């Protein structure tokens, strides 16, 4: 029964992790930052010239 309580708490911990991973994957910041850094680099070149 101690093990079963551990199982229960692990269940909700895993559920919380599965929610958080889905949310931060839906954020999709990688492509956005790739676009942002491309714009940054081109603007840096413009400021350099």
């Amino acid at each position: 029964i101690a093990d079963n309580l551990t199982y229960r708490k692990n269940l909700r911990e895993k559920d919380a992790l599965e929610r958080e991973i889905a949310e931060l994957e839906a954020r999709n910041a990688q492509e956005d930052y790739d676009r942002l850094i491309k714009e940054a680099h081109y603007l840096e070149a413009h400021r350099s010239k």
Binding site: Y7, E13, K14, D32, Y33, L43
Partner: protein
């Protein structure tokens, strides 16, 4: 010269945004490894309990 400082300031703001996105995705990959090892541990937890 005025053009120079305005260019530098706006590119610095762009830098701040890029660094924020970069640290966000770094935390995202950290959470990815978190999910990995957590599900690995959960497998053994379910194996025993």
């Amino acid at each position: 010269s005025k053009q120079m400082e305005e260019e530098s300031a706006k590119i610095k703001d762009k830098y701040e945004q890029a660094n924020s996105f970069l640290k966000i995705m770094n935390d995202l990959q950290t959470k990815t490894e978190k999910l990995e090892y957590k599900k690995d541990a959960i497998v053994e937890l379910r194996s025993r309990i």
